[PDB]
Amino acid sequence: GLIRLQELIMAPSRYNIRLKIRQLPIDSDDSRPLLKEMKRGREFRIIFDCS
Amino acid sequence: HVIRIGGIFEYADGPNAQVMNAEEHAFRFSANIINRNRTLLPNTTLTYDIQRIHFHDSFEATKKACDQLALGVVAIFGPSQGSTTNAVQSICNALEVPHIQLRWKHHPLDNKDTFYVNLYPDYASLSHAILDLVQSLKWRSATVVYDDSTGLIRLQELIMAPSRYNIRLKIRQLPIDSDDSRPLLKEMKRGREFRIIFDCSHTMAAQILKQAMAMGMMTEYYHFIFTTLDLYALDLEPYRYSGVNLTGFRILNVDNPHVSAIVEKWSMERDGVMMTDAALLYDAVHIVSVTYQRAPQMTVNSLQCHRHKAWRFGGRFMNFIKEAQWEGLTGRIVFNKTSGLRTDFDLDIISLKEDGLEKVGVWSPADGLNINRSL
Amino acid sequence: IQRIHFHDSFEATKKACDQLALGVVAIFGPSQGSTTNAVQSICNALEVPHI
Amino acid sequence: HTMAAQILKQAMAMGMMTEYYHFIFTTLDLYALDLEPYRYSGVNLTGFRI
């Protein structure tokens, strides 16, 4: 995904935007620890590309 | 009793190219001086083979490997391109052959393959050593500057590191379109930048030296981070007297007098410092040498590509390989046996004086840095 | 049409040499890019395009 | 001019080619060896012309 969107990673040259970065651990699919981490972030404007 | 390995190198005009690299130089050099080292193998003779191919082709080295197995070679080291080492690893694992590797390539756990190792350092351990560095710098603002698109994957650990250790960050690429990033450097001086990390080629590192020298961006207000070990080609007497805080890395035991003497004899033989890639070559030769020495007698055979002939003790000698314990030029060499791949390795931390460059710290994946009376 | 497994360059390399010995004009490769790098190599080597 | 080139070499070598440094250059043969490496440092600077 990095090489899929590194310009979108390097986007904030043209705009005042900050961002978190979250790889899904592909080891399994129970993201509920990572979901509670997102809950600690409690964020609302997030990009998603996966299967 | 004679044994023979092979080797495949990419060049400009392939077999019709002319100049040997220093890797072929060190290849013949190391192999012939360890044949001279009569500590190695009294009755057994180690010979070798060198193939020249072009850059960026799998099929060239495919034919070369089919030639080497039509001969039947006792060991095989790996090529440069990922597209090569794809098919190399495929036919190696398919035909009970080990694939010795040197560079980083992408490695899927989904591609459950076995018969290979790599001499390349695990980037997660590298990035975590850098994390140890910058938390020792106690920084809360930084900027990512990088040469090629590959280092983003190779540094995505450090990219995630602002999560558990909050730090401001800007992310920009060194443009490969020309030999110039000076207007970006003008942006960086306007970017108010003092905390910048650098991974690139030694050639691009020399471009950095030249430009940041010429930009007026050699300031003592700068404390900058450098990944590759290849400062030894590069002069620093135009640089080390400007007061710029700076940090290089090392994995090699230069501080071994023995290894330094190996470099000393190497220095007469084409600044005049033995390549890290040549050190990797020497270590790969010596680990395969030790794993061959540990084993009893086996069946050196010739097998064919279009058929399905696989050499029976290939798994046995793979068990010899992946479970080896060797103290190399870089020092301790040990694998993640879940992967069979070297992920454990120490990092010498070095930095500069007006005197010159000097070792300032160590690193490990386990731990890391270590520097009667009356009232 | 050749049914192959995942994640093997040499498998589709053999089958690519098979469809070359056949002689094919539209080249409909695998999912694994690391597999089909050699396919593109032999396509560009033997004067034939690649899809 | 030779020792002036020595000045440029040493303040180059010491990294004292700074924008916080403002230069009073006097003799007429300033141009002699190349000044363009010293150009893009970004200093304040002054010369003379006759």
Residue numbers in the entry:
A (entry chain A): 153 to 203
B (entry chain B): 3 to 272, 285 to 385, 402 to 405
C (entry chain A): 52 to 102
D (entry chain D): 204 to 253
Please quote the authors directly.
Ionotropic glutamate receptors (iGluRs) mediate the majority of fast excitatory neurotransmission at the chemical synapses in the central nervous system (CNS). AMPA, KA, and NMDA receptors form tetrameric cation conductive channels that are activated by presynaptically released glutamate resulting in an influx of sodium and calcium ions leading to membrane depolarization. KA receptors are abundantly expressed in hippocampus and cerebellum; display characteristic slow kinetics, are mainly involved in long-term memory formation and motor control. They are divided into two families consisting of the “low-affinity” glutamate binding subunits (GluK1-GluK3) that form functional homomeric ion channels and “high-affinity” subunits (GluK4 and GluK5) that form functional receptors only on assembly with “low-affinity” subunits. In order to understand the conformational changes underlying GluK3 functions in the context of full-length tetrameric receptors and to explore the role of N-glycans in modulating their functions, we expressed and purified rat GluK3 receptors from baculovirus-infected HEK293 GnTI− cells; trapped them in agonist and antagonist bound states and determined their structures via single particle cryo-electron microscopy.
To understand the structural basis of the receptor rearrangements during its gating cycle, we elucidated the GluK3EM structure in the desensitized and resting/closed state using single particle cryo-EM. These states were captured in the presence of agonist 2S, 4R-4-methyl glutamate (SYM)26 and antagonist UBP310 respectively. Further, the resolution of our EM maps is adequate to show unambiguously that in both desensitized and closed state the ion channel adopts a closed pore configuration, where the M3 helices are arranged in a crossed bundle assembly with the pre-M1 helices wrapped around the channel. In the desensitized state, the LBD-TM linker strain due to bound agonist is relaxed via rearrangements of LBD from a dimer of dimer scheme to a pseudo-4 fold symmetric arrangement, where the LBD dimers are disrupted. Consistent with a 4-fold symmetric arrangement of LBDs in the desensitized state, LBD-helix E separation in both distal A/C and proximal B/D subunit pairs is equal at ~21 Å. In GluK3 desensitized EM map, we observed residual density at the ATD-LBD dimer interface, which was not satisfied by the fitting of the ATD and LBD co-ordinates. Interestingly, the residual densities are in close proximity to potential N-linked glycosylation sites. In particular, the density near Asn 247 in ATD and Asn 402 in LBD appear more prominent in distal subunits as compared to proximal subunits. Hence, the presence of this residual density at positions corresponding to N-glycan likely indicates protein-glycan interactions. It is interesting to note that N-glycans at Asn 247 and Asn 402 are suitably placed to mediate inter-domain interactions between ATD and LBD.
